[PDB]
Short mmCIF file of C-alpha atoms and ligand atoms in Angstrom, two decimals:
data_model
loop_
_atom_site.label_atom_id
_atom_site.label_comp_id
_atom_site.label_asym_id
_atom_site.label_seq_id
_atom_site.Cartn_x
_atom_site.Cartn_y
_atom_site.Cartn_z
CA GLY Q 20 58.62 164.09 -93.73
CA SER Q 21 56.11 161.22 -94.00
CA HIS Q 22 57.63 158.37 -96.04
CA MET Q 23 60.97 156.61 -95.49
CA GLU Q 24 63.21 153.74 -96.71
CA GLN Q 25 65.59 152.36 -94.04
CA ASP Q 26 67.02 148.82 -94.01
CA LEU Q 27 68.60 146.72 -91.23
CA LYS Q 28 68.01 142.99 -91.73
CA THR Q 29 70.07 143.47 -94.92
CA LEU Q 30 73.61 144.95 -95.28
CA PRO Q 31 76.42 142.70 -93.93
CA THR Q 32 77.20 143.70 -90.31
CA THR Q 33 80.74 144.33 -89.01
CA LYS Q 34 82.26 143.96 -85.52
CA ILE Q 35 82.52 147.42 -84.00
CA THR Q 36 81.32 149.33 -80.92
CA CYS Q 37 78.56 151.90 -80.28
CA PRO Q 38 79.45 155.12 -78.44
CA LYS Q 39 75.72 155.49 -77.67
CA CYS Q 40 74.23 152.28 -76.12
CA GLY Q 41 77.62 150.47 -75.91
CA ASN Q 42 76.55 147.78 -78.43
CA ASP Q 43 79.37 145.58 -79.79
CA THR Q 44 78.37 145.39 -83.48
CA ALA Q 45 76.93 147.54 -86.27
CA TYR Q 46 75.95 147.43 -89.96
CA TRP Q 47 78.30 149.04 -92.54
CA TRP Q 48 78.33 150.48 -96.02
CA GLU Q 49 80.29 153.16 -97.94
CA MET Q 50 79.12 156.77 -98.39
CA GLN Q 51 81.21 158.93 -100.77
CA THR Q 52 80.49 162.67 -100.97
CA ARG Q 53 82.16 165.66 -102.69
CA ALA Q 54 85.57 166.55 -101.22
CA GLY Q 55 86.24 168.46 -97.98
CA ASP Q 56 86.82 166.02 -95.12
CA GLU Q 57 87.19 162.36 -96.16
CA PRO Q 58 86.63 160.93 -99.67
CA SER Q 59 84.50 157.76 -99.51
CA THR Q 60 83.46 157.16 -95.87
CA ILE Q 61 81.83 154.10 -94.26
CA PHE Q 62 78.88 154.57 -91.87
CA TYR Q 63 78.41 151.96 -89.13
CA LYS Q 64 74.89 151.44 -87.73
CA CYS Q 65 75.15 149.63 -84.37
CA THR Q 66 72.96 146.52 -84.20
CA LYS Q 67 71.28 147.39 -80.88
CA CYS Q 68 69.91 150.95 -80.45
CA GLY Q 69 70.20 151.83 -84.14
CA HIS Q 70 72.92 154.52 -84.16
CA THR Q 71 75.45 155.14 -86.94
CA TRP Q 72 78.65 157.16 -87.31
CA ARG Q 73 81.40 157.25 -89.97
CA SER Q 74 84.78 155.57 -90.51
CA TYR Q 75 87.74 156.69 -92.64
CA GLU Q 76 88.12 154.18 -95.47
ZN1 ZN Y 124 73.97 151.26 -80.14
#
């Protein structure tokens, strides 16, 4: 754990809320996995504290 590759200034942001700092917006992209919960999910990184969760589309 020494290098990294995160991005914020990029990725179109979407209007949402943050259950952590209470922000009112977050970044958003899709994240598909295998199959055992929700095919193709969208993570939303709040644009304030830097927290991200998942959607259902
Ligand atoms: Zn936040």
